[PDB]
Amino acid sequence: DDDDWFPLDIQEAFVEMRKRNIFDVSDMYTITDAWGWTWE
Amino acid sequence: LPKVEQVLEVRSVDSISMNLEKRIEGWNKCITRILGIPWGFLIGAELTIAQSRISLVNKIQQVYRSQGVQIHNRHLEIIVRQITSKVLVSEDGMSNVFSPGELIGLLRAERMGRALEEAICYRVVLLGITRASLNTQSFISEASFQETARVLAKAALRGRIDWLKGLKENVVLGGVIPVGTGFKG
Amino acid sequence: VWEILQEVMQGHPVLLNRAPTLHRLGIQAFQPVLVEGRAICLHPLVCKGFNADFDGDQMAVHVPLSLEAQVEARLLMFSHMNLLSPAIGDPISVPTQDMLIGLYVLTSGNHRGICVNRYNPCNRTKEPFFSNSYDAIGAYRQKRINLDSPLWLRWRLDQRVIASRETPIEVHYESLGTFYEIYGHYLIVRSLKKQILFIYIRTTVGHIALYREIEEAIQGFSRAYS
Amino acid sequence: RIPFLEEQVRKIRDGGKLLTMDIHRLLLNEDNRFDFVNEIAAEAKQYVENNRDEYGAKKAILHVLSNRMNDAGVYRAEAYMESDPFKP
Amino acid sequence: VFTQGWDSEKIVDYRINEEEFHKISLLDCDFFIRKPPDPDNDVYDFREMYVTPPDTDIYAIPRVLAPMPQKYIRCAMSDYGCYNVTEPPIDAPRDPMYKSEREVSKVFLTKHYRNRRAGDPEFALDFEEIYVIDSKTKSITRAKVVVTVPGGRNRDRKNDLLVIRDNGTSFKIIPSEERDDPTTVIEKEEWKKSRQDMERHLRKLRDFSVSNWF
Amino acid sequence: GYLTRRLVEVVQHIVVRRTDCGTARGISVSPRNGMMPERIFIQTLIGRVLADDIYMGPRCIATRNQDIGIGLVNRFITFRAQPISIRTPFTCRSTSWICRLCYGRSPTHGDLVELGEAVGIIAGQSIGEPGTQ
Amino acid sequence: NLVFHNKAINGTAMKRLISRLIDHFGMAYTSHILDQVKTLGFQQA
Amino acid sequence: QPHDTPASQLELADPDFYKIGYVRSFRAYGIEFREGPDGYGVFASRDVEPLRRARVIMEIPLELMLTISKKLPWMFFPDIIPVGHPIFDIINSTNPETDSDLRLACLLLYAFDCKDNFWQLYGDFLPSDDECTSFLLATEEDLLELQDEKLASTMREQQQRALEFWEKNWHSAVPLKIKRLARDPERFIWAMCIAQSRSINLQMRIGALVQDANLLVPYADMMNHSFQPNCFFHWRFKDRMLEVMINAGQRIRKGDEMTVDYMAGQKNNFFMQRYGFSSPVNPWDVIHFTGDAKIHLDTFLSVFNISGLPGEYYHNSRLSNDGDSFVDGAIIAAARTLPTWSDGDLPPIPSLERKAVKELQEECHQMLAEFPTTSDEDQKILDSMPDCRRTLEAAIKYRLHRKLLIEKVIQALDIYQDRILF
C-alpha cells in the first residue's frame, strides 16, 4: 500500500474523483442537452 | 530491468498488482449496475484510466528510485499515456458504425458516446509495449518492424493509405524528417 | 598541399561519433585541428562525457557537405550549446578525477589544532597583511610562504563575508570606541559611529587563487565580448 | 581591472571563441532555434548564388554571421579570419 | 509626555510617536527608548521602553531584569551578532547567487565617562555600566563586568580593553598592553576543540587508560 | 538495448506541433495524499505549467499558463498550498502530438519546448539509458 | 561576485556550482569558467 | 572649433546616473545622456548609417523596473510586495478598468520605502514638485488661464479624485506601514503624476506567461516625444530585458536626439492631460468646423505633395522639397480635419472652391477671435517671464500652439486658393 488508491465502493469514489477534479456534473451532457431540443 | 519490462508490457493487470485488478473488476460491475446511461460507461472509463495511469507511474518511479537513478515524470507519462490511450468495444453490441471487436481511441469513443445514442459499450484495455506499436496509423515503419508478414498482408488487403506523418516512415522513404529544421509552418 | 588543407579546414566543422551510441550526446560536432600522429585528440571533459574507456575506443569522423548541414552543425551540434542532460537537467560536463583532486587539494586547507601546534598557544605572528591577492601569489611563487601557510588578506569591504551563524570569539572594545570583532575566519575593525574601517580574511593561497582565476575568467570573457 | 588578463583575451580572439559567443547572443532574440538556422542557410545560399568566388573572406556562413554582428554595433572581423602576423 | 505603567507584558492600548524614540532593530524584536533633544542623538532615557515584533505596531512593555537608570545618560551603541550567508534558489537569468544578512542578537550600550561628548578633548568610556538587549528573551539587563586591573578608581580610564566572550555573557576589563592578537585566540580555541575531539576519538579504544598523550 | 529499442519504437510520432491545445483540465498533486516526502513533491512540479490560479487570501501567488521553478515550489511549501493543478501530457487533447504548455520546460535549454522538437525520442532515450546502470 | 569559499570542494559542490553558474551567467560564460577551472586543477594536481 | 549640433547646447549629465545602473545588468550602446533646463535627454554619439536591421541602444533588465498587470489577477512579476502587507488591500480595492495610475503610484511609494531597491537611488533623478510639467501639480489660476473649459474641468475632477482616494485610504486608523509611505497628501499626488507621465504599456512574456502590463522602466522615460520617431521599445524574453532599438533604414548622425512615440495617434489634448506636453506640429489635432462649405480633397493633397492613404499621410520630398517647406504636421492635420468632398474623378470648379475657401477663412477668423488674447501677446508673455511655473509655461505654450495651428490652416488655405490656378 502506502500509495495513491481510490476507495473500494463507488459512492465515495465519486466524491474522490470530484475532489481531484477528474469529473464533475457540469460535464454530463449529450446532443439533447447541448443543442437544446425538448421534443425528444 | 525485468520489473520495468513486465510493468511496461503488461502481461496481465493482476501481475503488477492484485489491488488494481480487484478495483477494476469492482468498478466495471458497480458501474454497469448503477448509471446504465452512457454517462456510466464514460465515468467508469475515466476512473479506470486515472487509476491505471497513477498506479503505473508510481510503480515505475518506485522501481527507478530503488536503484538510485532519477528520471523526470514527463518521460514516463509520455509512454504511459500511449500504453492506455485505447479502449476496446464489447462483443455484445453491433451496429453500422462499429464492430463488436475493435480497438478505438478513448477520446473518439467518448465523443461518439456523447454524440450517438445507439448502445455503445467499451472497456478500457491496457495495451503493451509491443501490442500498442502493432496497432498504429502507419504500416511502413511503426507496424512493419516485428511481424513484417501479416502487417503487410492486411494492409494490402484493405488498401491502406498511409500519410507520412511519422519519423521512421520518412527515414525508410528517404525524404526530410518533419522534426526540427524539417518541421515547416 | 598541406597549407591548402589547413586553409580549407580552418573553419569547416566536422562531426565525431562513437561506435556505441548509447547516450544521446554520443554525436557531437568539433572544429578539426591538424595534428601529427595516429590518434584523435579530444578534450578531457568531452571524453568523460562520451563514456571514455581504458581500451582504444574507435571514433568515426564525418564531414558535412551542404550549406544547411554546416549551419546546423555550427549552430546546434556544438558542445557549448549542450551542457545539460535531458534526463533532469544536471550538468553532463563536470570536472574529471584529476581536476576534482586538484580543486580538493586547493580548497582543503591544512591542519588547524593540535596537528599544527605542539603545546597550548595560551603561553605565547602570522604572515604579514597582504594588501592584494597578487602580492600573495607573488610571494608564493617566490617560495617565501607555503601553499598551506595561513595569511591575512585585506578585503576591500565587499560586505559579502562568507561564514556560519557563529558569534565572534572575542570583541576587544577599547576606550576610544574602536572595537575589533575577532571571528574564526575574519576580523572586522569597527569604529564608534557604526563604520566598518577594515576587514581582514584569514585564508590560504589556494582559495584566493581559485577566486581570482574565476573572477578574471569572467572579466576577460566580458571584455573579449566587446 | 585585473592587470594580467590580456593573454586569455588574445587567446579568445585567436582560437575562435568569439563565434561561440556571437551565436549565443544571436539566439537571444529568436523564439525557435530552427527558424534561425533556416534563415541563416537561406541568406548564405542567396549570398553564394550571386558571387561564387566572392562569398566572403573564406566562407559565406561566417560572412553572414559577421554581417549580422556588425549591424548590431559589435565590430567583428571579415568572416572571422585573422591570420597570425608572427608566422615565419 | 512621560508615562510609566505596570510591568505586565501586554499592549499599552495606544501608539507612541516614534520620532521621540530610538529604534534599535534586532533579529526578532525592536526596542524604543525615549530620546531627549540633543545636538548628537545619543542621550537615552530608560524610564520608557517598548518592545514590538519586527515591523509591527503592537507595542508592549519588555522584561526588565536589572535596575535601570532614572536619569539622562549619554551612551554609545554596538551590535553583537553573526552574518548568515545563504544560497538562494536561482529562477531568473541574473538571480543573485548569495544573500547576506547581519542577524544582530545583542546590543551593547556603553555609558560615556562623566556624560562627556565625543568631541571633548579628553573622551573616555565607562565599561562598568553596560546594558545588553537580548532578542530571544525580550529582556534588557546589566553586564556583570569583572574589573581586573591594578590602580582602582584612581587609575585613569584611558588604558582599558573590554574583552567579551561566551556569547556576550563574560566581560573583563584588562589593560591594553596585555591584549591578545586575533591569531593567538583563534589558535587557542582551535587547539582546545581539536584536543577535546581527539580525546573523544581515542577514548573508544581498548588500549586507553594505559596510554600517554605526547 | 532491447528495452530502449522497444521504447523508442513505441513513441516516435509525438512531436510538439501546437502552442496551446486549449484544454481546461489538470491533474491535482497534493503532498498529503500523493507525495509523502517533500523531494518527490518538488521534483514533480519543476518545469510544469499551472492549470489554475493559486490564491492565498486575496493575493495570487501564480496564475494560469505560468511555468514553475524551484522558487515557486518553495513558496508553495512555505505557504502550505496543498491543492495544485498542473498541466501534464495526461490532460492533453491529442494522442498523436502534444502542445508546448502540456509538456512544459525543456531541461536542455531551460525554457518552453520549441515547436518541432522530438520529445518522444528524447523520452525514450532518457528512460532507456539509465537501465544499463 | 562569486561566493568566497573557505571549505573543501568535492564533486557535488562543483556540480552545484556549475548548475548555478549556468542559470546565472549562461553556457557561454560557464564553458570558459570550466575550462579555466580544469587548467588550474591540472596545474595543482 | 566645436561642432554645432542640437546636443552641443546641453551639458553632460552626472556620471553617477549611469554608474548606479552599470553596476546592474544595464548597458547603453552608442548613446549619451545629457541634461538641460527642460530635463534629461538621450542623444547619439556615433554615426549610424542606414542599417538593414534594428540596432539596440539600451538594455534594461526586469529587476530594475515596476510592473502591474492589466487584468484582474494583479501579478507583480518583480516580487517586491510580501504577502500580508496591507498595501495590497489598497491596490486591490480599485476599479480594474478606469484607474491604473493609482496602483502604479502605490507601488512606487512602497518601492521608495524598501531597502536594496534601485528606485531609492533612482528617485534622486526624477523631477521634483517644481520642475514637473504635469497639470495635477497646478493651481486654479493656471487652470483658468488655459482658456479651455473641458480640459480644466477634467483636470479639476482628476485632482479631486486623487485627493479623495488619498483621504479614503490614508486615514488615521491606518497602521504605520502605510502611513510612512505618503505622510502628506502632496506625496501621493506627486506619485500619481510620476506614474501617469512615465508609464509604458507593453505586452511582456516571462517563462510561459504572455500578458500585458503597465511598467515604469528606468532610463527609458528620458526618451523625448516625436511624431516621426527614431526608436521603439522591444521586449526580449530570453533574458527578460527591455530594448530600445533604432528603426531599420533611418540614418542617425552624431548629436541627433533619440526619440520614441508616446500615445501614437492621439489628439493634442490628451498629451496635455497626461504628459503635460504640447506640440504645434501634431499631425492628429482636430479643428472643428460648423460650416457646410466643402473643399476638394485630392487637389488639396496634390498641391501640397501629401501623397499616401488617408491613414498614412506623408510629405513626398522627392516631388518637391525646397518648394514645399511649408509641408509639416500642421498641413497634414488640416487636410485630415478639413471638411472635404470627393465624387469619383469629377474635376473641381474654381468658383466653388474660391467661394468655399473664403467661408472657411471667415469661420477660422470668427473662431480665433473667441479667445480673449492674440498670438503676439502670448508670444511676448511666454518670454516675458524668464523663470515661471512649469504649469503656466505649458498652458501658454498650449494656447500659442492652438493659435499657430489656426494661423497655419489659414495660410495653407490661402496658398491653396492662390496656387490652384497655375
Ligand SMILES: [Mg+2]
Ligand atoms: Mg572501450
